[PDB]
């Protein structure tokens, strides 16, 4: 009869209310922690029990061993993207008797950021409390190592490590007409999205799972799916250029308009895809490859696209290409967004604002500066004082971003939007 007491007068309540009412209350101790632990030797008894019973049952965790060289760097946000369980996986685990609430809790993609001031040669991600020592999350076939690298050391004559055709282990997903063809080398399947699922003959296919994750759709099995023209074989036997770039958070790389290559043994990118030194190269890679959904923009995607269009209306072809690349980088694939900055309507309110700003992965870019050739042609030099500060280096001939002392004008300068930091043609 407790239901009639907690919810007197109501016969039905939401699951949220019911669950929130079944949370066990906690009484905050008036004492200090030490006195509470000493009370009745409760901590002593807990320690005895833990050593006697629980400690033997604790599994042994693996020791971390892989290390890389690291150097002092600007303060950055290391983005860790931990995918959650997919819908079918959670359904099967629930049907297998695993706790439904815990399984649901793992159902959501997690994105977190860590403040770290240490960079590796390969822009690797680091463990907690060990960035200064260079302990990496990545763990050391040559082909797999070359796939995840922007600039492979040893090309192997195939798309994975350079220009060429498709190796055996590489699959690819491409969009033809209104269907998504996934070809792996042995099996070829076709997929479509009815309303919110991704209908395919066999959703269990690894390429099908990757495509569903890239499109953020629940995999579904629909035998009555098939396309008319499937030139996949030709493109599988054709050769394509390899954009020199790190793998996007989805673990794949773009090789053509709405087409991405995937490697079986590469789960997800273990290096930061978008950084200060590689943002504009990545934007130029996908100039005309359509939306990618590879870079997270701070704020609203629609507002960012409006600013991008407003800057796109005024500018030279190079700036227009860079802006279109940025729009493709930030626009999710398949969502109701108009990334193409040629059919998108020009927003007057965006033009009202004097400066145009977009934040991509913690990098603040002024689109007006991009239009006037700053991040790629000339740096922005602002004088900070006419006196020399102690502990600051002299201004180089092609300074990167940072604070320097210029003897030619005996002044402290803050260099930003440097082509030596964003373009870095080397």
């Amino acid at each position: 009869s407790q239901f009639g007491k907690s919810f007197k007068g109501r016969t039905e309540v939401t699951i949220t209310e019911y669950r929130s009412h079944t949370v066990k209350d906690v009484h905050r101790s008036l004492l200090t922690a030490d006195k509470s632990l000493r009370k009745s030797f409760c901590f002593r008894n807990a320690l005895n029990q833990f050593l006697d019973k629980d400690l033997p049952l604790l599994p042994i965790r693996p020791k971390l061993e892989s290390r890389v060289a690291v150097k002092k760097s600007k303060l950055r946000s290391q983005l860790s993207f931990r995918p959650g369980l997919t819908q079918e996986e959670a359904i099967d685990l629930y049907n297998k008797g695993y706790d439904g609430d815990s399984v649901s809790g793992a159902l959501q993609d997690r994105v977190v950021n860590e403040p770290v001031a240490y960079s590796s040669a390969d822009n690797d991600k680091f463990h907690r409390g060990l960035a200064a020592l260079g302990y990496t999350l990545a763990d050391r076939d040559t082909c797999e190592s070359g796939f995840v690298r922007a600039i492979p050391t040893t090309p192997c004559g195939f798309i994975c490590c350079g220009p060429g055709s498709f190796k055996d282990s590489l699959g690819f997903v491409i969009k033809i007409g209104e269907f998504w063809h996934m070809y792996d080398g042995f099996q070829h399947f076709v997929a479509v999205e009815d309303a919110k699922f991704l209908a395919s003959k066999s959703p269990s296919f690894w390429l099908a799972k990757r495509l569903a994750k890239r499109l953020n759709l629940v995999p579904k099995e629909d035998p009555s799916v098939a396309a008319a023209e499937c030139p996949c074989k030709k493109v599988w036997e054709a050769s394509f250029a390899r954009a020199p770039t790190a793998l996007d958070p989805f673990g794949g790389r773009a090789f053509c308009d709405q087409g991405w290559v995937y490697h079986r043994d590469v789960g997800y990118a273990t290096a930061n895809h978008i950084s200060q030194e590689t943002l504009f190269q990545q934007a130029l890679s996908v100039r005309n490859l359509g939306p990618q959904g590879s870079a997270n923009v701070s704020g609203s995607i629609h507002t960012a696209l409006d600013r991008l269009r407003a800057a796109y209306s005024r500018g030279t072809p190079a700036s227009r290409s860079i802006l279109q690349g940025l729009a493709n980088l930030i626009t999710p694939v398949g969502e109701n967004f108009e990334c193409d900055l040629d059919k998108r309507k020009l927003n007057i309110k965006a033009l009202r604002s004097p400066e145009r700003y977009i934040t991509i992965e913690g990098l603040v870019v002024n689109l007006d500066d991009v239009v006037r050739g700053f991040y790629l042609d000339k740096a922005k030099v602002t004088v900070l004082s006419r006196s020399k500060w102690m502990g600051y280096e002299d201004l180089p001939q092609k300074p990167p971003n940072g604070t320097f002392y210029c003897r030619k004008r005996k002044a402290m300068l803050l260099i930003s939007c440097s082509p030596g930091t964003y373009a870095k043609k080397r």
């Binding site: 209310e17 793992a106 020592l133 934040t359």
Partner: protein, 513 residues
């Protein structure tokens, strides 16, 4: 010693102040400051900035996130028994359930739709009306918040009515949405360090940086300004009702109801107050009372001052300052080039709270410090060793430990003084896995939680182990709960399983490859 640091140091090494003072004095002082601001003598509470450019949200569907309306944090519940108003402190879950019981409504969204749909303030929505709801939602209870470093006099905080919380959730959600759509650089969800980095990037084209703060922030945000912003973004009658309750708010101090016609009672609407300034200009990077705007000339400084005055963002002359070699926001100080400012920064000490919790918290603090450039790693391991010795001095007595095995820490009778690096890279005896920052709960934490729980009637039937795809906004009755539990139990039995096996994403992902 904090005065002789070569770099920046907030002075966080010791704990914050404690106070057993009653909350009456601080609450009365805050109300008096609000009244003085209202009379128009010290600070501005009249908003004159232009908000006509804010996008209108009035056509968006009305959605309520029920998860925001339930929690263990306290709230004020009002009862009219014999013509008198009695305000009692309860939990937000209990207050929300009482509100939904008073007016027969299954979900908060149904309640808000019913309230918006009535045709008379006297019309009944159960055992209440919109008039009674507005009357009751203006009452607040005062409490004291202490343990804030740098504040010897603890601040006054206010517990609100569930109806006020319900309307506030909607208005604040939409204000955050408009901030995301309108801000020059979105920072309503960034961390302090992320805000500092974005600010450093933003102000790198100007010479002078105004490290700014506002004084009496919540007292100078008037109901008129809130209503102005809400009308600009299109909150309809919800904004009108909320502003009406704000203007007529009363606070229960001791045993007296004190009217507070001015202010917004200490951060009730952070997003709306932020929009009050962000909706009039794009020259600031700010959330609540903290902005990092920059300027080049004295004329630009005067324009910034005028904008701040017009937005009701009174500059704090005590704390605001100008810098050229650094920039600070959210207590995070960076150099103009973006590097973290050398020094301890916000590094805090770890008070003794148990043999193993102290070591775990010290390890977490040192890992955070070494991830940044605050201190090198050898300094961190030396500090961890010294902390282990201090813990051994404090705790190695018969009232806590009786063991002597080597692998235990010296504070529990062992002789192991682990290295920080060895602990971090899981290169320790399994007993040390709890001391790792990312490890499981320590023995002290489990003992403390058990002690808190074992402090007391009747419970509702457990509604655990649901289908991970069922939305939580669906309705359930007692019979429905029993039937769902029975069906799940039958399914588990058919699988030959007792209570479901706990699922850990980490272990499952380890078995997957």
């Amino acid at each position: 010693m904090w005065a002789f640091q070569e770099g920046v140091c907030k002075g966080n090494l010791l704990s914050g102040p404690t106070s057993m003072k009653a909350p009456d004095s601080a609450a009365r002082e805050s109300i008096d400051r609000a009244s003085e601001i209202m009379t128009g003598k010290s600070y501005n509470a009249v908003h004159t900035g232009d908000l006509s450019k804010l996008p209108n949200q009035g056509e968006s569907p009305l959605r309520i996130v029920d998860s925001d309306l339930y929690s263990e944090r306290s709230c004020c519940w009002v009862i009219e028994k014999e013509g008198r108003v009695v305000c009692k402190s309860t939990t937000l879950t209990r207050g929300m359930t009482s509100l939904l019981n008073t007016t027969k409504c299954s979900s908060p969204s149904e309640l808000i739709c019913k309230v918006l749909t009535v045709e008379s303030l006297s019309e009944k929505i159960g055992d209440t009306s919109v008039e009674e709801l507005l009357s009751h939602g203006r009452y607040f209870k005062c409490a004291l918040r202490d343990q804030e470093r740098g504040k010897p006099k603890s601040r006054a905080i206010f517990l609100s009515h569930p109806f006020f919380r319900l309307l506030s959730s909607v208005v604040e959600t939409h204000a955050r949405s408009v901030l995301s759509k309108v801000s020059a650089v979105y920072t309503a969800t960034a961390s302090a360090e992320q805000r500092a980095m974005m600010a450093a990037q933003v102000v790198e084209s100007r010479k002078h940086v105004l490290n700014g703060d506002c004084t009496k922030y919540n007292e100078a945000i008037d109901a008129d300004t809130l209503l102005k912003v809400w009308d600009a973004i299109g909150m309809g009658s919800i904004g009108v009702m909320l502003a009406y309750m704000v203007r007529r708010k009363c606070v229960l101090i001791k045993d007296t109801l004190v009217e507070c016609p001015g202010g917004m009672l200490m951060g009730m609407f952070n997003a709306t107050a932020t929009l009050a300034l962000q909706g009039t200009t794009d020259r600031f990077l700010s959330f609540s009372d903290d902005f990092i705007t920059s300027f080049n000339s004295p004329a630009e400084l005067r324009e910034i001052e005028d904008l701040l005055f017009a937005s009701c963002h009174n500059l704090s002359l005590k704390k605001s300052y100008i810098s050229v070699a650094s920039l600070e926001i959210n207590s995070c100080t960076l150099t103009r080039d973006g590097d973290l400012a050398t020094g301890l920064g916000c590094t805090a000490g770890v008070p003794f709270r148990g043999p193993l919790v102290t070591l775990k918290q010290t390890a977490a603090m040192l890992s955070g410090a070494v991830d940044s450039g605050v201190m090198p790693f050898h300094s961190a391991e030396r500090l961890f060793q010294i902390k282990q010795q201090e813990c051994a001095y404090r705790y190695n007595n018969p009232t806590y430990t009786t063991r002597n095995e080597d692998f235990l820490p010296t504070c529990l009778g062992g002789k192991t003084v682990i290295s920080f690096q060895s602990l971090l890279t899981w290169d320790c005896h399994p007993f040390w896995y709890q001391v790792h920052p990312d490890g499981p709960d320590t023995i002290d934490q489990k003992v403390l939680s058990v002690l808190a729980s074992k402090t007391r009637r009747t419970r509702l039937e457990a509604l655990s182990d649901l289908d991970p795809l069922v939305p939580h906004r669906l309705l359930v009755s007692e019979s429905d709960v029993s039937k769902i539990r029975a069906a799940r139990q039958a399914h588990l039995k058919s699988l030959g399983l007792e209570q479901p096996t706990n699922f850990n994403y980490a272990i499952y992902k380890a078995v997957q490859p």
